Amino acid sequence: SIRTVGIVGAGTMGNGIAQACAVVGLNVVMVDISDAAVQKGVATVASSLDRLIKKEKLTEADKASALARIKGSTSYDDLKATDIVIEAATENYDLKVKILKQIDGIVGENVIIASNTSSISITKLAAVTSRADRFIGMHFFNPVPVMALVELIRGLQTSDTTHAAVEALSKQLGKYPITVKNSPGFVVNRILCPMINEAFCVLGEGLASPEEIDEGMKLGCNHPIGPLALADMIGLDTMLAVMEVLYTEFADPKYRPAMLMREMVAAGYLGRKTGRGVYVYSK
Amino acid sequence: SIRTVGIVGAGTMGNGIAQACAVVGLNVVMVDISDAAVQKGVATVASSLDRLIKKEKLTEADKASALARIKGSTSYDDLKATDIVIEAATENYDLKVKILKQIDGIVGENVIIASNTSSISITKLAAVTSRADRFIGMHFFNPVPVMALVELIRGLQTSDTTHAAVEALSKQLGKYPITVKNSPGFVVNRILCPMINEAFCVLGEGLASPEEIDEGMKLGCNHPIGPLALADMIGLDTMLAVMEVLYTEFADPKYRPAMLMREMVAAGYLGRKTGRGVYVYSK
Ligand SMILES: NC(=O)c1ccc[n+]([C@@H]2O[C@H](COP(=O)([O-])OP(=O)(O)OC[C@H]3O[C@@H](n4cnc5c(N)ncnc54)[C@H](O)[C@@H]3O)[C@@H](O)[C@H]2O)c1
Ligand SMILES: NC(=O)c1ccc[n+]([C@@H]2O[C@H](COP(=O)([O-])OP(=O)(O)OC[C@H]3O[C@@H](n4cnc5c(N)ncnc54)[C@H](O)[C@@H]3O)[C@@H](O)[C@H]2O)c1
């Protein structure tokens, strides 16, 4: 049984997960490095909950009822309390390793250790823990409370039992889990991101205007957002880096980053987060 | 002014266009090779119109009012009547050429000749007519009455005037036109179809189940349909052929068809149209 979920990292993704567990009545032990980071974690869960109140989504008593289940710590031994720990602090490799080893040292042999990540090899991480068969990848989606799926990524070592447990936890949290063998871009980024890249290739070659490329794809394929606009939301620096990973990990030019993508990144035109990428934004 | 539109071909796409012109009060001269094909063209416009009646979309009098404007011929000299002729009979090259030359012979020098096509080089076709600057590509979308966009594809020769006229005609028909320099896959198929191909690559490599790949993309990127399901609707034979065109026309393995795609095609598992492709269907 998994009634208590360890969480390391209390940022966007961390509360994300904590909330998702808590509104289901699971006990979360959320760990960060200050008291500032922890409570600030608790503020966005409160604020988010307060938004749900205000559009007739259940309810005042549950807002209260979820939060009680969140034990927000700063010491790391609190995770002996826990059925499973999810790391969710960093896309930095060396740092990620450290965190997982520290986690590996505290919790008992049979506890499952997961790591949220978009790009990092789940197999390589699993190998740094003393029980690799108890390790598995998760990838949650970027507004976590509402987004109804998770990629569950098996390292080469991830056992079937580790898999079914997390698979069930995910279904519990009310998400549809997707199982994927560890592979660059897993499933989602693997197919989506080279499409974004092809849009840049089209824009790069002068074939059409951006706006028209984007309308092409909205109206033609009934995509909610156009790939260029979407790139501007994700971050072209985030896009370029995914493509560089595909190209490096596969060692195959099929995944060349688009050149215009490289140029915008070099220039600092990174999308909405700098006010300019493919399109210009208001600031 | 463009008040009378030539149409060669009275199949799915042909009526498609005719209707779209007629419900706007444009005079269509629709030409096919039998009287069977012509009237059968007129039947699907009637049937489609009768569906619109039945969901409170205007109206009995307009159903009547559109049809009057459709002059359905079988002789080819009827197209001297016309401001512009759109070919819409065939994706066969040699045949396409013939039709356009025949059309080129009838109509006057200043009449615009277009060709609907997903894959055929608009430049190469424009070159077979005596006035290439009066030639342009269209690509309409596959349920034409409702689909609100057209790709407008300039051959190297297409003049600006030819372009603006058709651009305006398109806006008239109530569609958003997309302008594209002639290039394999234009814009839409160029970015969409290699994404479908990447899904097959993922399925091909054993990374995930189809259903999960498809859910990955629906829920993750809010795509209406999943790429594999979509491939099953388009036809895997139609998919493979688009990829083969990309690979052949660019002469670049970046667009390798996925191997699983090749195998399903070789096997006859072509999607919904044979009852089996990626998934199995009821027949
Ligand atoms: N946000 C995204 O774009 C995104 C998308 C998919 C996956 N991810 C994954 O999730 C991770 C977390 O991203 P986020 O959006 O929550 O970041 P964020 O900037 O919102 O917050 C990161 C949090 O991690 C904490 N942290 C850093 N080092 C730590 C340590 N040694 N121990 C405990 N906590 C530590 C920080 O104090 C901070 O509160 C990413 O690094 C990435 O691996 C992120
Ligand atoms: N349907 C699609 O999947 C699709 C999608 C995009 C573009 N297109 C383009 O549009 C073309 C038409 O496809 P469709 O779906 O209307 O086909 P269809 O099978 O519904 O009908 C084709 C029609 O063209 C007519 N035709 C054939 N040869 C002719 C000639 N020499 N003169 C006059 N008419 C002739 C036939 O009699 C028939 O009525 C395709 O070949 C392709 O170039 C098709």
Residue type, B63: K
Nearest CA to B7 out of B76, B69, B85 is that of B85
Q: In what side-by-side order are the strands of the sheet with B4-8? A: B70-73, B27-31, B4-8, B84-87, B112-116, B135-140, B149-154, B176-181
Characterize the bridge pairing of strands A135-140 and B70-73.
unpaired
Q: How many residues does chain B have?
A: 283
User: Distance between CA B15 and CA B88 in Å, rounded?
Assistant: 10
Would A1-188 and A192-277 be classified into the same CATH topology? no
Q: Tokens 């012509």 identify what position?
A: B38
User: Distance between CA B135 and CA B86 in Å, rounded?
Assistant: 10
User: Distance between CA A273 and CA A271 in Å, rounded?
Assistant: 5
Q: How many CB atoms lie within 10 A of CB A179?
A: 19
Nearest CA to A186 out of A236, A136, A256, A226 is that of A136
Classify domain B1-188 by CATH architecture.
Answer: 3-Layer(aba) Sandwich (3.40)
The vertex-B280 CA angle with B274 and B282, nearest 5°, equals 75
Please report the DSSP string for chain B in residue order. ---EEEEE--SHHHHHHHHHHHTTT-EEEEE-SSHHHHHHHHHHHHHHHHHHHTTT-S-HHHHHHHHHHEEEESSSGGGGG-SEEEE-S-S-HHHHHHHHHHHHHHS-TTSEEEEE-SSS-HHHHHTTSS-GGGEEEEEE-SSTTT--EEEEEE-TT--HHHHHHHHHHHHHTT-EEEEEES-TTTTHHHHHHHHHHHHHHHHHTTSS-HHHHHHHHHHHH--SS-HHHHHHHH-HHHHHHHHHHHHHHHT-GGG---HHHHHHHHHT--BTTTTBSSSB---
**What separation, in Å, do the N-terminal and C-terminal C-alpha atoms of chain B show?**
48
Do the Cβ atoms of A108 and A84 come closer than 8 Å? no
CA A176 vs. chain centroid, Å, equals: 15
Largest CA distance in chain A: 58
Q: Tokens 């720990």 identify what position?
A: A85
Choose the closest CB to A254 out of B149, B191, B253: B253
Cross-chain Cβ contact A215/B183 below 8 Å: no
Nearest CA to A165 out of A69, A84, A44 is that of A84
* Mutate-to-test residue for ligand 1 from A12, A117, A122, highest number of ligand atoms within 8 A of CB: A12
Residue in B closest to A196 by C-alpha: B191
Method in brief: X-ray
User: Distance between CA A52 and CA A169 in Å, rounded?
Assistant: 23
User: Distance between CA B243 and CA B169 in Å, rounded?
Assistant: 31
Q: After which residues is chain A broken (C to N over 2.5 A)?
A: none
Q: Where are the domains of chain B?
A: 1-188, 192-277
Tokens of A170: 């995910």
Tokens of B69: 């404007």
**What separation, in Å, do the N-terminal and C-terminal C-alpha atoms of chain A show?**
48
Cross-chain Cβ contact A149/B199 below 8 Å: no
User: Distance between CA A3 and CA A82 in Å, rounded?
Assistant: 8
User: Which residues of B make CB contacts under 8 Å with A?
Assistant: 141, 147-149, 151, 176, 178-181, 183, 186-188, 190-192, 194-195, 198-199, 202, 205-209, 212-213, 215-217, 219-224, 227, 253-254, 256
Q: How far is CA A70 from CA A13, A121, B112, B182, in A?
A: 15, 30, 70, 58
Residue type, A146: V
Q: Which residues pair with B10 in a beta bridge?
A: none
For this entry, resolution in Å reads 2.6
User: Distance between CA A7 and CA A85 in Å, rounded?
Assistant: 5
Which residue pairs, CB below 8 angstroms and at least 24 apart, start in B39-47? B39/B72, B40/B10, B41/B10, B41/B11, B41/B14, B41/B15, B41/B72, B42/B15, B42/B67, B42/B70, B42/B72, B44/B12, B44/B15, B45/B15, B45/B18, B45/B19, B45/B70
In the reported structure, the alpha carbon of residue A14 is separated from the centroid of ligand 1 by a whole-number distance in angstroms of 7
Residues of A labelled as active-site residues: 118, 139, 151, 189
The 3-state secondary structure of chain A, one letter per residue: CCCEEEEECCCHHHHHHHHHHHCCCCEEEEECCCHHHHHHHHHHHHHHHHHHHCCCCCCHHHHHHHHHCEEEECCCHHHHHCCEEEECCCCCHHHHHHHHHHHHHHCCCCCEEEEECCCCCHHHHHCCCCCHHHEEEEEECCCCCCCCEEEEEECCCCCHHHHHHHHHHHHHCCCEEEEEECCCCCCHHHHHHHHHHHHHHHHHCCCCCHHHHHHHHHHHHCCCCCHHHHHHHHCHHHHHHHHHHHHHHHCCHHHCCCHHHHHHHHHCCCECCCCECCCECCC
Do the Cβ atoms of B224 and A222 come closer than 8 Å? yes
Optimal mutation site among B142, B173, B201, B219, interface A, most CBs of chain A within 10 A: B219
User: Distance between CA B270 and CA B239 in Å, rounded?
Assistant: 10
Do the Cβ atoms of B120 and B130 come closer than 8 Å? no
Do the Cβ atoms of A193 and B220 come closer than 8 Å? no
Cross-chain Cβ contact A202/B219 below 8 Å: no
Q: How far is CA B138 from CA A55, A222, B17, B116, B151, in A?
A: 46, 20, 11, 5, 6
Tokens of B195: 């994404």
Cross-chain Cβ contact B220/A194 below 8 Å: no
Residue type, B197: N
User: Distance between CA A96 and CA B77 in Å, rounded?
Assistant: 75
Q: How many residues does chain A have?
A: 283
Which residues, 6+ apart, have CB-to-CB distance to A102 below 8 Å? A76
Nearest CA to B197 out of B181, B185, B182 is that of B185
Characterize the bridge pairing of strands A84-87 and B112-116.
unpaired
Q: How far is CA A47 from CA A78, B38, B115, B211, in A?
A: 25, 64, 56, 36
Question: Which residues of chain B are within 8 Å of residue A147 when distances are taken between CB atoms?
Answer: 219
Optimal mutation site among A141, A171, A213, A219, interface B, most CBs of chain B within 10 A: A219
User: Distance between CA A187 and CA B198 in Å, rounded?
Assistant: 10
Residues of B labelled as active-site residues: 118, 139, 151, 189
CA A104 vs. chain centroid, Å, equals: 21
Please report the DSSP string for B253-282 in residue order. GGG---HHHHHHHHHT--BTTTTBSSSB--
User: Distance between CA B27 and CA B69 in Å, rounded?
Assistant: 5
Choose the closest CB to A207 out of B147, B180, B256: B180
Q: How many CB atoms lie within 10 A of CB A25?
A: 13
Tokens of B104: 């080129």
Which residues, 6+ apart, have CB-to-CB distance to B164 below 8 Å? none
Choose the closest CB to A223 out of B212, B216, B223: B223
Superfamily of domain B192-277, CATH level 4: N-(1-d-carboxylethyl)-l-norvaline Dehydrogenase; domain 2 (1.10.1040.10)
Q: How many CB atoms lie within 10 A of CB B159?
A: 17
User: Distance between CA B250 and CA B252 in Å, rounded?
Assistant: 5
Which residues, 6+ apart, have CB-to-CB distance to A51 below 8 Å? none
Residues within a 6 A CB radius of ligand 2: B 8-14, 31-33, 37, 88-91, 99, 116-118, 142
Cross-chain Cβ contact B188/A141 below 8 Å: no
User: Distance between CA A152 and CA B73 in Å, rounded?
Assistant: 60
Nearest CA to B203 out of B273, B243, B261, B242 is that of B261
The annotation status of B34 as a binding-site residue, yes or no, is no
Residue type, A76: Y
Query: Helix B227-234 to helix B188-204 angle, to the nearest 10 degrees?
Result: 110
Which residues, 6+ apart, have CB-to-CB distance to A252 below 8 Å? none
Q: Tokens 């909950």 identify what position?
A: A49
Question: Which residues of chain B are within 8 Å of residue A207 when distances are taken between CB atoms?
Answer: 180-181, 183, 186-187
Nearest CA to A68 out of A28, A119, A111, A17 is that of A28
Choose the closest CB to A219 out of B176, B194, B216: B176
